[PDB]
């Protein structure tokens, strides 16, 4: 359950004459359990800005982004950093185009880690990571090697597996399937649909038409 | 409740030299990175919060106990058993005339260890952890290289499984491979053992991969603070924007 | 013809400690970065080629003159006038009891400068070049921070406009902003003044932006060498591939 | 004038069980002054590998890439590193999607530098950099600020200007116009055509159909 009310963000670039670059103006968005909302708009409409504000990666200047944490409601715009850290650890999951990981950790442990942080047993985490990698057709030979030594597509299948290792009540998807071929894309679509079925509030940004049509349950116009 | 609390802490050698009006809370199982300009007072603040520099103003509370209101014996006990300190220059936190094994084992014996074989085995295990060969345990740190000495200091200050570790540029002098090894080790300690780390670093990549929260210091004042990725990707204070724009992209 | 030539150079404290069978040529107006594992012998090689460590085998020729066949007076003259040496720890290349102005001016006076005002002005100019405030010229390096001391050492070893500079991790202890300033300064010196630099670094980004050629050292032997970008993007030796895979991506 | 004969390259990934990844097999390619050759092939055919071998960024295992330097002929596959460095400084220019520059140097000096390295006067270098930036419609306000503080498109217009600051007899173009809009793309096309007219041997990799048709004078099939 996501509740965005009057969130507005303008970047102040002090490095260049302190010019103001508005990217969000009184935006709002409501998301419910078992629903997928995809942000649609011309490039530069604030899609990325809003999505990462939902993940607290950006800080809107004004407004509220209230997300249910546990059985609570938390305004990420004013919550303490510890609150946001826990909300990410348990409540708000993120999938994107980039595997920011420690370089020398094997792929299986890169996928297991976010679940092991929650205290889940290591056997269950390993089994779920193996399952996710197999579904995303990641070769077994690459499970025990660092992602940095793989190709871009394999690194991204690993990042998607790491994103889906934990069953987050809220989920964010910044073009997960973009580069993937049709088979791997379809696998990610099936994973997203399963997340929706279990009751995951999914917010996504998709460029592919077929992926959006198959996944999106509602469209939010970010043009304004 | 915070493992460490700093309120209005200030120490100035002279107007503009040091830190002033610094407050922050650190909990178990999280990393508070400190980044800033060379000369912003990061090292002075680290010394002050690590019981190595009495502040002129403000208070420091560790487990609800004022740090500098305690007796000197209690502070030394903290620094001897449950506090780790990693200096920027490894030799400052090492005994030059004492072998690496002795440097690691001093802390263990200070915590009650009295079995020579177990201390030796633990020292060798920690040397292998930081990838230092176990055959260098008996060699004095003067024979070690800069990175080897830094890793030896890290092992010395981490062998006791401390609850709070203050580090000043621990990655300095380390090749990227052993650097990643150290980052993984620190992450594992923080998550599994609930270790708390206050790390001063200039490599914003290490702060990104390790620090859970960040402080950005300039001319002795904290200019920006908050979530690490928010600060790095959504900086607000001019200095922070300069700082992240100066990063060398690989 | 090469400004510096190294042929079969070898210095070992013990089997595997040091460097062995090292040969390379350095010309004016280019940078030869050295990267490798902590413990590969980079510092030992840098000392040997900088006239600070007599090798057990091989020869070093500077302007066609064997480095260690010359008299000790000539080597000291080289290190005093036209050779710069930047140590990993700045205080090792600084006079603790001498102010920053004096540290910079020692080299200038060693080159024949005998006007106090001009020496002071040059020292202040170089302090501003490394962004150190000109009001810290009279302060002893002990009052400087690690980055401040490192920049002071760099200015001291660059004030004389030398022809060859051996640096050991000059970027260590430097925030990314002053690091970029230093990189630009070194590039400008190398191109305009034809300066030659042998730099040992672990930040592969700095080697990418600065080094024209690279050496990759492991267990005391050069394992891979060639064009910097070719080595980084097209590594051949297993160690190099590990090393560039360990880089923290920003 | 470029002369590629029997160049073959296979990557050995020691980090992953030492698997071999062939990407070039006995490839050859002839380029003449005042001609543009574009590499065409399915993704993974060795286009990037060959282009960067032409720039010495990769080292083919066997074969020859002989380029005219001065009034000479130089096999980049066996030349010394100094030889390659000078060949890049004066003879072989490179344009790509990425501005690897020192962070704190203004855009005008980022564009001027490659020409100032050749000893050209600073007034001429500044004038030519200003001309190139104006042609690529880079705002005047951004000339005196670091590229890292700009957007991706502006950074890429600056990288293209830096690439074209020096009149290289050989030129390499790894998708310069890819992200650019139609106006800025057309400007880069005009610059490439002018380079061809002066007698520049251009080797390119282009994904856009219109750009390739307008620029390409010959097509090299990299599928094999
Ligand atoms: N013992 C001292 N006596 C007088 N002034 C000092 C002393 N130590 C530091 N100063 C100044 O105090 C300021 C901050 O010191 P310090 O905390 O060590 O800086 P820093 O931020 O850690 N720099 P760096 O190590 O490069 O990241 C600097 O201007 C120092 O020059
Ligand atoms: N004085 C010494 N006596 C005996 N052995 C030494 C001595 N100095 C170095 N060794 C060894 O010589 C090897 C290489 O030394 P050194 O050249 O300083 O390494 P390095 O590659 O520079 N490491 P780093 O500073 O981390 O990048 C190391 O195993 C050192 O432990
Ligand atoms: Mg410091
Ligand atoms: Mg060294």
Residue numbers in the entry:
A (entry chain K), D (entry chain L): 1 to 224
B (entry chain I), C (entry chain J): 3 to 252
Provide text from the study:
In Escherichia coli, the 14-cistron phn operon encoding carbon-phosphorus lyase allows for utilisation of phosphorus from a wide range of stable phosphonate compounds containing a C-P bond. The crystal structure of a core enzyme complex, Phn(GHIJ)2, revealed a symmetrical hetero-octamer consisting of a compact, central tetramer of the PhnI and PhnG subunits each interacting individually with the more distal PhnJ and PhnH subunits. Here, we show using single-particle cryogenic electron microscopy that PhnJ mediates binding of a double dimer of the ATP-binding cassette proteins, PhnK and PhnL, to the core complex. ATP hydrolysis induces drastic structural remodelling leading to opening of the core complex and reconfiguration of a metal-binding and putative active site located at the interface between the PhnI and PhnJ subunits.
To capture PhnK in a stable, nucleotide bound conformation, we introduced the E171Q mutation in the Walker B motif, which is known to allow binding, but not hydrolysis of ATP in ABC modules. We then purified the C-P lyase complex as expressed from a plasmid encoding the full enzymatic machinery (PhnGHIJKLMNOP) using a C-terminal double Strep-tag on PhnK and in the presence of the non-hydrolysable ATP analogue, β,γ-imidoadenosine 5′-triphosphate (AMPPNP). Structure determination by cryo-EM single-particle analysis at 2.1 Å resolution (59, 737 particles, C2 symmetry) revealed the core complex bound to a dimer of PhnK in a conformation reminiscent of the ATP-bound state of ABC transporters (red subunits). At the interface of the two PhnK subunits, clear density for AMPPNP allowed for modelling of a nucleotide in both active site pockets. Inside PhnK, the adenosine nucleotide binds in a very similar way to what has been observed for membrane-associated ABC modules. No structural differences are observed between the C–P lyase core complex when associated with the ATP-bound, dimeric state of PhnK compared to when a single PhnK subunit is bound (rmsd = 0.3 Å). Remarkably, this structure also revealed two copies of an additional protein situated on top of the PhnK subunits, which we could identify as PhnL by mass spectrometry and inspection of the EM density (yellow subunits). The association of a PhnL subunit with each of the two PhnK subunits thus generates a double dimer of ABC subunits, both of which are in the same orientation with respect to each other and the core complex and thus potentially capable of nucleotide binding. In this hetero-dodecameric, 327 kDa complex, PhnL is in an open ADP-like state with no visible density for a nucleotide. In summary, we conclude that both non-transporter ABC subunits encoded by the phn operon, PhnK, and PhnL, can bind simultaneously to the C–P lyase core complex in a double dimer conformation with PhnK in the ATP-bound state and PhnL in an open state compatible with ATP binding upon closure.
